Symmetry: D2
Subunit: 481 residues, 4 copies
């Protein structure tokens, strides 16, 4: 019937149009209440209990703010109430494809369980969306509020996942290209999804967010750029945009890639791999799926949430004993032990195809110290983390259009040297973390020696504590002294 108000600690009072309420009040959407935003991060940062549900509300709210702000200041863009609703829906729905513990599922579990498939949460969001619509009779409701389902469903999916295949989009024409830059911005990654998570994650983690999305919204305008209408920021704000990506990188370094968070995600992934043959999830027509195959049936995937963790933990079946035991070690805080971190030097870049060979390389190192235990490849975990500004080696600010106060309809470019010499020289790097599955004192001492020796042999950077954890190894390396 009518609009609803929701109170959110980040944004305050969010108004929801009744079509949005109908999308929200479904099993496919409400499911997001049972998926933690930060996965294993809650086990390090106890405030991070938030789930994808409330993040999705915030993304939909902000998407609506930005589109409304553009419309109000530039009526000549002809943004319709239909446009506004479609953008809010895409915003609400771009997290629907997340799986248990969020990035651990698409980032660790599925790549190990189903190495042959190419799955992303984005693709999952489109499939869940289609399933949500079809299972809940949403198309008639959309027509009731003036949407045109064929066009608008296409538009919504395109906002989430990009072109479903010269202007490549079918949901809207080039004169509305700027609409595609709101929810998931494939050109430079500046979108309302980051703005909600910066604010929400900081609130919960107890870390402070430096980025002012409202200021940015106020200074945003649409300008013509190479025969597209694109969103442009005020020239002055270029520093704040660099700062936005800097904040993204700090949040990754301190929280999202926390070394213990990551190892908890890894352990949970391992328990899931060991339980995968025994857990059954009933999908369409009563067919049974596994944790690794629920992504093939949306009805099964609907029922795949963080509950899988507790189902395993609370199980009594002897078949689940191995999985259950890994989870029990998490509760007792008997975790795989962090050994250290290093980075490649020079132009060395570690390729994905080499990842599996790394633990073997570490166990093959020949440190000169007397060791009571010997460790094997299987005792080591090597995590390779690609840290960047969202576009691999590229500077995303080279893909942003700006305008000046004296000519607000004229788009310009601003280069790095026009801003500051104190900015980063590079935009991507790799971090390598090593952990040991043997947690006793002697094994850990040994693991350290192998680790630092491997760093030396590969010409990686000297670990920060290298001289303390491996004082007999670090003197060999001239470049470190």
């Amino acid at each position: 019937d009518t609009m609803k108000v929701i109170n959110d600690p980040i944004h305050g009072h969010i108004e929801l149009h009744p079509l949005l309420v109908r999308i929200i009040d479904t099993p496919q959407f409400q499911r997001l209440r049972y998926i933690k935003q930060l996965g294993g991060g809650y086990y390090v940062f106890p405030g991070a209990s938030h789930n994808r549900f409330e993040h999705s509300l915030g993304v939909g709210y902000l998407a609506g703010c930005l589109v409304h702000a553009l419309g109000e200041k530039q009526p000549e863009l002809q943004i319709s109430e239909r446009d506004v609703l479609c953008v809010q829906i895409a915003g609400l729905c771009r997290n629907l494809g997340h799986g248990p513990f969020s990035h651990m599922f698409d980032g660790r579990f599925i790549p190990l369980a189903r190495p042959e498939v190419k799955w992303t949460h984005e693709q999952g969001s489109v499939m869940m969306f289609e399933h949500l619509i079809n299972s809940n009779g949403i198309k008639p409701v959309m027509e009731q509020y003036g949407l045109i389902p064929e066009e608008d469903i296409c538009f919504i999916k395109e906002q989430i996942v990009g072109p479903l295949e010269l202007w490549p989009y079918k949901g809207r024409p080039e004169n509305k290209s700027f609409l595609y830059e709101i929810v998931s911005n494939k050109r430079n990654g500046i979108d309302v999804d980051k703005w909600d998570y910066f604010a929400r994650d900081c609130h919960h983690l107890g870390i402070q967010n430096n980025f002012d999305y409202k200021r940015f919204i106020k200074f945003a305008r649409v300008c013509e750029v190479d025969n597209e209408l694109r969103i442009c920021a005020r020239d002055k704000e270029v520093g704040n945009l660099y700062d936005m990506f800097h904040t993204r990188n700090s949040l990754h370094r301190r929280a999202y890639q926390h070394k213990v968070g990551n190892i908890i995600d890894t352990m949970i992934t391992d328990a899931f791999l060991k339980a995968d043959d025994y857990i059954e999830i009933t999908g369409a027509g009563g067919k049974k799926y596994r944790i690794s195959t629920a992504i093939d049936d949306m009805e099964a995937y609907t029922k795949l949430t963080d509950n899988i963790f507790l189902e395993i933990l609370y199980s009594t079946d002897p078949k689940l004993k191995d999985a259950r035991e890994i989870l029990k070690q998490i509760e007792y805080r008997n975790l795989f032990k962090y050994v250290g971190e290093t980075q490649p030097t020079g132009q060395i870049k570690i390729k994905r195809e080499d990842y599996e060979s790394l633990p073997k390389e570490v166990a093959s190192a020949k440190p000169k110290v007397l060791l009571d235990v010997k460790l094997k490849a299987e005792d080591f975990i090597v995590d390779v983390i690609n840290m960047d500004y969202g576009m691999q080696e590229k500077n995303p600010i080279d893909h942003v259009s700006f305008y000046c106060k004296t000519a607000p309809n004229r788009a310009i470019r601003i280069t790095k040297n026009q801003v500051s010499q104190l900015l980063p020289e590079k935009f991507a790097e790799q971090l390598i973390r090593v952990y040991c599955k043997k947690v006793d004192r002697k094994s850990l001492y040994a693991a350290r020696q192998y680790f630092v020796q491997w760093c030396a042999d590969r010409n990686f950077t000297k670990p920060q504590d290298g001289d303390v954890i491996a004082p007999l190894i670090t003197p060999q390396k001239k470049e470190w002294n």
Copy 2:
């Protein structure tokens, strides 16, 4: 083993002594990660995703702050490091006995499932604590850090639940009476547990907390009162104490007793009642328990969390169909419908023994109006809520001892009229909410006519929207205009 630092969004960096870490890193404590602080409140306030776990860390931290502050200002009290740890442990552990959805479990479910038993979360905390200690070899660890288990375990339990029965306590002597006022203050309810939840619940709900616990700590002292050493507040702070209880009452009104939060707790309770025969929880020695009997075995209770909700929702067994269908209605937001609220007038006080008769009474009202449908007792839910300042009809500030700047060791009393005439004249009241299980438009119209007629017949207060929802009924009542 050394101290750990945890970052909490409410309190910042909390330091945890290694004994505390050992208590925390157990299944019995980690269980609290899977129990929402506010139960069905998350279904109204989407920021309220927090669980009892992080609340318990905060209660333990604040307990430590208060005891440390007292010791530092008054060395003559002889507060030992042992005392400090025992108070931190009680603080950490006073939420261990909570069940699924927190107050819904002890407040709605158990009273209906096991009407013959007298269960409280406090009692449950003592039992889970004992089980935690015993199952994890904590006593030797306590001795390692200078605790004396026999005395100190007793002291901890007493802080949580009160005397395990003229000085009634055995864990500490009258010399240390003030220590019993920190974690769970039976005398007037001013304790660190409230202070954490005020700040934490407000952070998550998106409502602002007006109470300054750090100011109160700074102004607190121990003074002799009737041959006990008790905590006294500075005279000046009496207004801020009344404001504390006022804030508690606002939080209940706006959030904890939100009409839709309460109906969701009621629907979930109903699903639990319908599933209770079929859900099995394995406890000690492989014995099986139900949701309603897990409270009799701590090993089973350890595994009784919010996960029960999803286990039901995801079930395929036809035996669980009824329970599962209620939960499905929650997801679709097809909830029982709020009809209205009223209060008794005069000295009328509704007794617990009469609660069951109320839906009958409503259905027996004879509104003088044309009705398409007739409703029966079973179509109505009547919720009676007792709102007070924590001590029934009493003013808790009558039970607080104060001191003056001119004589800091002399305790005094301050009465209501010494403070302000703008304070409440009563400290307890009752609210009556009525809901209808028939949700269609005609049933709801009818429910409104019965409801308002019943209010008129009983001489209850006029519902705020009475003239709008029942314009043909409200004219009959002279007292209402």
Copy 3:
């Protein structure tokens, strides 16, 4: 000329229309940068350095928010861009008449310096506004943006001060009556001025505000009430409105009437009285005024700010020696000493005409304790403070119109008993503070005996520390024992 953005810590990014910018960029408006919001409160709460200038920006902003919100939800009201600008201007300009140290000037100094005149900051705001307009060529600028100066200048003044004398207003007709409720709400005091100062004063004082003005704005509507269009709140929000006035009262008790803040305001007022014959302020046509007569000439008043305080403090003229010495005692923190506080009982209400007799009464009390020193009337200060809900004895919520969800265009009333029995039974009271100008130990002891005896003789409430500060006096009073 285009819009400007200002960043405010309370409201974020505030957009200012160019007409508003022109009003702001005048000596009459910028003057507010040199008048502390809380006067002598900065000398107790060191974060309270804020001035009337930034408060005025915030009031203008919120005035705009509320009027825009109403227009967007109810287009049928025909709120024009002209209406919006007039309301923003009134909001911006309702503080223009404040004098040095804000309420100290109109509340203490002018009543003692010019007892024959009836001066308010509201009257001063109208005069300064007229002077601002005329001195800066604003009328042509107003016309340029579609305002009609004769009607609209009237309207703005009426919003600030009320009718400049059946519909009593000339700036707008009855169908726009709701516009008069925004900036300065004479009917019940619920206006945007309070909302900005609650948030701003809390931010600076270091106290937390619990009123959510944004929620209130979202729930506000215009409805017909007795043939006027008035602003109505949603029924549900009635609790929050009581809480609003409760917050106002707490802020007055903790901050705005802090006993030391008030004594500093008194000492400053005293210095101003002693300097008044000697300070010259040049006004229109070179005429000279005094501090007490600058209110008669807006050109002189433009130059009358907190700077008077420093002019006196830094003076070398022997004529200002007495004034300067009082200010020097403030810097050394040699302040008059607080003796205690009490309240009248029963029907007793202390009239303004009796205020001067009260120190005489205190010095006339006859304690019957042995005293080293005797004190005279001139050694005592007695401060009488009227605390209420903004309408003397009346409940302002009786003057608020509400609507219900089922009939949003139908206004209703809600009485106290329809809300809660835990609300105040009275809405006004008086506090009496007593201070001694003799600050030595023996004088202060004596002052305490006189004070408490005077309380006993007048049947005032027992001071909270009475038994400690005057143990030989309090036993005499049966009613206190």
Copy 4:
């Protein structure tokens, strides 16, 4: 005399020892209430009304936190209550030397008025401190609380200004070296002064601070480094330390060097230069000083505050007409106009001795565009701003000592490549801003052409809006295209 509590919106309840209260309650300290922390920043960011007084309380509080934290963790350091108080005093007093509008006084005015003198606010703080102590009888009070004035006064001054002339300090010996790193850290700039102004300035400006000083305090330890006991940070925190300096730089870029804030500081400085021959400030024995010579007499300098601004503005003396007129233009917002910003390229570094030649260079540029007006050197202002990490070209993190969890007493170093490749390559740069004193449309157009042509001639970076403001000039430069 007992402790006082002050409530601060940044830190909460700060306890002040009575010796500190005595230092605070003097004309020399209370003077800081009348000096804005951010000077002309209040004229851009209206929330920035805060003064140096409340900043100084915060620096003293944090200095006490850090020293107390070190003592509690490491009793073997033998930090005494005497050490604690001396560090709190130095913290309280390190802002005493600030002049009107803070950095504008020492940063713009004194360098132009007294080019021969080398004045810093640091030197001024030492002088004011000595004068504060002597004028107010503080030495006996210090002895009363166990301080030893000769040693401890030396120690305090050394903390503020560095060695008053191998261990160069006399106030404390090398085993207490770490105490010198708290208030003003000459080695790397990581001190409690930054930490307070980050949090306080952000709170007031409406920008969010992302540095967590409390976390840093908790991780700090004293370790031996080259036969000194120095403060060491945990290795892990190195990222956060880089982020701290990054935050400092953002605050300078967005706020402290705001182009309009700076121009206001310049205009005020200009008014002060024009008033300097006519304003009189009475110092010791009735002698008169000027604004530029008050720094030579502490009794005069005590009375030199932001009041000087209003004294000029409110003056009637025809000798002050020129000064008064500049201030009046500030009120009307007729400010000098910003033309643009650029930076040097390559190894070009602009020296202080060249600053005065720059406007001449700009006016000598030869654009070869048709110009209606010609501009002269005196029409241009050129502001050169040095932005760095506090140590000119150096990386301050190269001057930080760290420790590892496995060996907490063993200090180590961490290099930039051990941390991240996404860090800055350089640590100092210069910004050049140009403004025009002729504010009309034709002058401003011309100014732009000269500016951009000058950039091209000097091989400076292309202004961001260069192509829009000077489309005929920017094509000439190949390097820009």
